A paper describes a structure:
We characterized biochemically and structurally the [name] gene product, and show that the enzyme, [name], is an exo-β-1,4-mannosidase [EC 3.2.1.25] that is highly specific for β-1,4-mannosidic bonds in mannooligosaccharides and ivory nut mannan. [name] features a 200-kDa large homotrimer composed of three modular monomers. The modular monomer structure contains an N-terminal catalytic (β/α)8 (TIM) barrel that belongs to clan GH-A with a sequence placed in the GH5 family of retaining glycoside hydrolases (domain A; residues 2–364). The A-domain is followed by a Rossmann-like β-sandwich domain (domain B; residues 367–586).
[name] crystallized in space group P212121 with one homotrimer per asymmetric unit and diffracted to 2.2 Å resolution. Crystals of [name] grew from a solution containing phosphorus citrate (pH 4.2), 30% (v/v) ethanol, 5% (w/v) polyethylene glycol 1000, and were subjected to soaking with 1 mM UO2(NO3)2. The partial model was then used to phase the 2.2-Å X-ray diffraction data using molecular replacement to determine the crystal structure of [name]. As expected for an exo-acting β-mannosidase, the active site in [name] is located in a pocket with the two catalytic glutamate residues (Glu156 and Glu281) buried roughly 10 Å below the surface of domain A. All three active sites are accessed from the central void of the homotrimer. Two loop regions in [name] (residues 103–108 and 320–339) cooperate to form a steric block that closes off the active site to form a pocket. The steric block has been assigned a structural role in converting a GH5-type endo-mannanase into an exo-acting mannosidase. There are no salt bridges formed between individual monomers, and trimer stabilization is partly provided through 17 hydrogen bonds between the B-domain and the A-domain of a neighboring monomer. There are no direct interactions between B domains of individual monomers in the trimer. Two regions in [name] map have weak, unresolved electron density, and were therefore not modeled: a flexible region in domain A between β5 and β6, including the region expected to form α5 (residues 213–221); and the linker region that connects domains A and B (residues 368–381). The missing regions are located at the surface, on the side of the TIM barrel opposite to the active-site entrance, and neither is therefore expected to influence substrate binding or catalysis.
Author numbering:
A (entry chain A): 1 to 212, 222 to 366, 381 to 587
B (entry chain C): 1 to 210, 223 to 366, 382 to 587
C (entry chain B): 1 to 210, 222 to 368, 382 to 587
């Protein structure tokens, strides 16, 4: 099992395959599966999966179950593991076993010999016990090595409180150690991270973006990980921009946007996706939601699709008691029937696996230094702040009917024949980034620069924007108008506003009190359009008036975008 | 002493005893009393307390005075304690001595061998010296065991910063050790926590709601719960307006009701803070409201803070000089004008020692720190909503109680009507609520929670979620006027489709806002907005809005 | 050298000396100077400084270059350090070396054997390694003792993350120890802290206001000369000004200097315009002509610009904070940039004035200014306090007052020297209230914005002239002076009290009747008390500054009293 050059899974025989299926816990016992072991129920569920066309099943090796005392592995659980691996094989399902679990449905399930004082990532004993546990489980997977769908490091390790208390360096080291332990048994295994969208919207230490001989791996900030993962749900307050739900185009753009970011750093599996609401009343809306997000996730480059989760789980036990929405996430009801509203996933999965037998018209700028914790070279970017601006720009550009890509500022910029238009959404850019943006613009790039950064505004930025800072001025709102309507910007980058003097640039727009607000500067073959306001922040500050303002928000980008 | 079946003190004679009196430091020296020891002034203050009809005095054994070096107790201080205890008995006053002090009047006073890096609850050495210090003092109290009004563990231990750095489990264990230590000497002593209202409005590890049988197992070895309360606007999570404000006046009875649901409650500290002659018409009216209300909430005793004005020009009265003017009596030994009703009240309660129409819902999981079964409730958030609803309902002439969700719901004969004020409820609570509604209960459910909205919640509310919707304001009207709700639970709104429930009110865009659902013999009225948080968000407009706020509950409340 | 009784440097001959010059890194390499050592370029930059009339240059001994391994001091660096000191004396420039660097231009540069888990101030190994580093470099300085312009302890030690993790007592002891180490080698050296305006606007442990060797500010033991740094950048201050042209922005640096001056001698060790482009030239010129005399009037004893050269070196930290690349005084061809020539002129005038050898209102600096581990502090915190001080200071200057600072941790000067005091809603303990009572009785004129209810007992009642009858809803208070309406939305600690007079007169009421401003004669003086948080209310109206600011100045003028 291997990942091909276009980021797709390949089986031992070198044919491509698209993982499709479900994350799994039995209905009757949820997370207690290893203890309750309702084997007829499990095998009947695997039969149901196979009959729907699924070719993979993600399941969780719950660590306390398997190592109840330090170094003593439960032989009954290991035998149940082997029975499961066997039963999936005979039914055409490639198991995707998840080791470090850990985080699950609102609970946290660790071995009793780990105290809350022992940080999963940094504690010396936990590192050793974790490595031995990874090697032990991998040993028991080795007889199935060619029938796996990768080995999942753990479930949403970036959601753990332990991420706040361990340094990024320590998380990086733990990941190296746990992948290395797996490779002491299966050196060629495909390992997935198991992380969710907090890779994009927070700094948990689980990062997209390093610079690389340990192993050839696409994302060196996650050493030893062959396949990046993305998880995503429509719940409005699980994201830094609050959408309105299943019918909202903003909400629908979130998961494809996350996949697009991940895809820029390596192959990406949509390892978890769900509607959360799955009742009969929700059926018209969940159906339309799925018909939007799944093809968009495909176009964004996902290499596989696993629903959360297979069955409703009426088990009256932790953590389904305190977060009872977790009890009704099944693709399938009690009778083994696909729930009204969700059938499209079945149709899409069958389409995708028969498939396995263009272009973006604008790119959002991902800054060279994205994560802030212990980053001494970062000019001030923070994931939650950057990602709020990227999410909204991404959605509003798609409402202007643009095809939106991501371009990486920590890599040389693609020549303007590949990436022709770049939008910087008020993120902070260092000297090297400016120089490269200059050379890119010189060969013909069209740059739309929202709120260039005064902290990095010296000679280099002045020659690129085409203007010098004459003085600061009060950060009071700027009111203006394009040819389609009026605009008011209340936010400015770092809370500061500047008075500029043109030094090559033309004044494309002024505020209503006469001063320059949008500049336009031609530099070699390209053209820099700079806006002296924090556009995305201003729009986000007027979120309660979203209904009536959104059309003009999106019309803003269209008016200012130029073409060679 | 002993605590009877109804939560009141009993003396050796088996008579009911209602403690009435004051917390005490001397005027001339304040917290330095054990060092300065003005014995004549002290004994004369004890005289005046007795002449006023008091039967209890609360005073503080200040640990640094008694244990200036580890394991070395200061015999001079112990002599002084004996003289004090003797002087109280000779004068008719039951001493309530408070051990771990500690926290006092804006200062913190620990022995000099307790480093700032040594947490009081979790440090191994501190725990052992604490147990040893508690035993030692209880040894010197034993000669008076039949004359104490209980032993007070310490003053407002829940207010210490150490509460923040120690886990709830470590606080629980410290409480078990120290009460266990006292009981090695006086196994039958009545022990009191000494805690204030932060038991309700914060998670300090001093908790209402979970060996020798105690009423409140979260405080192991404690016999009598305590409550402290002052009208200061910004000492509470809802800003009242002071002595004349019915909201501020409802705060202390509210806290007492909450504590009373978990066990017997002494009103161990209450005061007006403002005691000047200019304040006198207002202190008089405030005390006339809260003392009867606290009685009806179930307080079993009343101790004023504090007995004398304290002009002592020393720490901590220099930096918080309002502490210098909390006396019940001036320096001429006269009860301050405006405070006299407390003497009248106390006399009345010791002479006599010879209702709900709706209940507020206290969630099963109240405290968040290291609580893995908690669906999201935090004391400050929950108490905010509870304080406001309690006050609004009392303005609607309702007599409000508290029903505990961590215990089986009483039948609708006892508790007929329940309001859930936008708190988070697990599956087990929903199932128990549904069973209680089945038997006739009337449920007013403000903001049923999407995170626990699956099948059980849908059958009880009588609707399923069709989708989320924008969390924009909901405007509506009852038959008495308009309403606007800007706050929703977890900052999310849902679109519902009915499945058995009627639509009672819509927002002015047509979509359902309030539902009403007959379930068995009872009825669930559900509001799809965070009602209490919305009102609280309109706090600047309280004066013009408060009337409709309490009208809201009156409009929606169901009776059989 | 020595500091005289007025607060000014004096050379060995006993003649007054005003440091004027620049902070320096070479343009080609920036902070890598010790490693790159472009000596020809360095020595000609020193020529340039002397030709401009400067007498002092401030440079930074970067620790990791001078001790790459514990206990082993690089000898090439020590020889380069020596050649640099030679070049300064050979050109009339007094070197001011900075030892603990450390913090520079948005980067942090420590030796590699210091891990990030080792706090500079509290880690025992770092403490002892630091003292040895101090003593070692001081030893290479003492050949030049009579030619230094003091020794600078470090650069903005108070900006370090370590300040948050080390207690104030730990920072205090570290400074005791490091100054002690310098004095082992040069017992009479002039030592400077190297701190900036965070001394005033935060609690970093680097504080104003505390047998040891007598120093002017005991909170910083062993420090002979306090330092101040100041830049116009709007969001580097707790009150957001509008830039080079904003009187508020221009008042900040003098305000910080006046505060530090109330505790000891102050060197304007860093100042700059940040914006130095030719487009900025009209505004830098005007900003410099304002702040430089005003800092002289505030008591600064020297002036060092940041920094001498533009630095295009494409290396850390110029890459992430590229504004740091264009702070030079002179351009690439070596001429003073347009808009900045006034500093050279002001420097030459200060040289001359030194060759030949007014406060109408005082702002109340509370007895307990810093909050960390201060058990006697009634609740003052530097950022809150300085926000109100800065605003009041600027507004009073706009009403054409000359504004001083009076220290509440010292006996109050008699009304002959300090006649009028303004308390800008800060928290006052009992001992401070009695001292204010005695001062007013002697004739003091007190304007008391927001007397603190937490300290409102009998002493405050007697001084204010009123008692608290009750709290009241903290809704806004609307009133009118003879010159316009006012609305106050902010009240101290978010609480509002209903008062009852007891000797005071009701000077002003709110538009619903209740007292708002009181006046109370006490002995020969007079207390005017406002029952609203004046400076916070004005700060809450910052978006409307442009239309509102004049009425804010007029508020102070209306209420200020005389005999």
């Amino acid at each position: 099992m291997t990942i091909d050059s276009s980021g797709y899974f390949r089986d031992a025989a070198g044919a491509r395959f698209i993982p499709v299926g479900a994350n799994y816990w039995p209905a009757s016992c949820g997370v207690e599966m290893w203890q309750a072991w309702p084997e007829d129920e499990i095998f009947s569920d695997l039969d149901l999966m196979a009959s729907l066309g699924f070719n993979t099943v993600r399941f969780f090796v719950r660590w306390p179950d398997f190592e109840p005392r330090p170094g003593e592995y439960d032989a009954t659980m290991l035998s149940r593991l082997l029975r499961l691996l066997d039963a999936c094989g005979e039914r055409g399902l490639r198991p995707q076993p998840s080791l470090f679990v850990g985080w699950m449905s609102g609970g946290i399930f660790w071995p009793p010999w780990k105290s809350d004082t022992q940080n999963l990532f940094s504690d010396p004993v936990m590192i050793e016990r974790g490595a031995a546990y990874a090697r032990t489980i991998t040993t028991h997977l080795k007889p199935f090595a060619t029938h796996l769908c990768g080995i999942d490091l753990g479930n949403e390790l970036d959601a753990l409180p332990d991420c706040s208390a361990a340094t990024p360096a320590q998380v990086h080291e733990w990941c190296r150690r746990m992948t290395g332990a797996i490779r002491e048994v299966l050196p060629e295994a495909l390992i997935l991270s198991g992380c969710d969208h907090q890779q994009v919207i927070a700094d948990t230490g689980w990062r997209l973006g390093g610079s690389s001989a340990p192993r050839m791996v696409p994302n060196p900030a996650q050493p030893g990980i062959d396949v990046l993962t993305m998880h995503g749900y429509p719940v409005p307050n699980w994201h830094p921009v609050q959408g309105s739900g299943l019918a909202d185009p903003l909400t629908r753009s979130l998961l494809p946007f996350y996949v697009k970011c991940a895809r820029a750093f390596g192959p990406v599996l949509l390892q978890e996706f769900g509607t959360i609401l799955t009742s009969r009343a929700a059926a018209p809306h969940t159906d339309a939601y799925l018909r939007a997000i799944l093809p968009a996730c495909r176009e964004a480059g996902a290499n596989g699709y696993l629903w959360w989760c297979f069955k409703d789980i009426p088990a009256p036990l932790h953590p389904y008691i305190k977060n009872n929405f977790e009890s009704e996430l099944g693709l399938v009801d009690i009778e083994g029937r696909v729930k009204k509203g969700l059938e499209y996933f079945v149709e899409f999965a069958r389409a995708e696996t028969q498939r396995a037998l263009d272009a973006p018209t604008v790119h959002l700028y991902w800054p060279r230094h994205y994560y802030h914790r212990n980053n001494h070279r970062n000019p001030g970017n923070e994931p939650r702040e950057t990602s709020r601006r990227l999410i909204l720009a991404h959605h509003l550009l798609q409402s202007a009917e643009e095809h939106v890509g991501i371009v990486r500022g920590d890599q040389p910029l693609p020549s303007p024949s590949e990436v022709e238009r770049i939008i910087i959404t008020g993120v902070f850019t260092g000297l090297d980034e400016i120089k490269e943006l200059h050379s890119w613009v010189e060969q013909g790039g069209q740059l739309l620069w929202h709120a260039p950064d005064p902290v990095n505004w010296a000679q280099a930025m002045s020659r690129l924007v085409g203007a010098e800072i004459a003085d600061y001025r009060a950060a009071t709102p700027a009111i203006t108008a394009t040819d389609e309507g009026p605009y008011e910007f209340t936010c400015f980058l770092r809370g500061m506003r500047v008075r500029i003097e043109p030094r090559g640039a033309q004044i494309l727009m002024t505020d209503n009190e006469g001063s320059p607000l949008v500049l336009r500067h031609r530099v070699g073959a390209g053209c820099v359009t700079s806006v002296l306001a924090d556009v995305e922040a201003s729009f986000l500050s007027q979120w309660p008036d979203r209904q009536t303002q959104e059309a003009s928000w999106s019309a803003w980008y269209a008016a200012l975008l130029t073409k060679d």
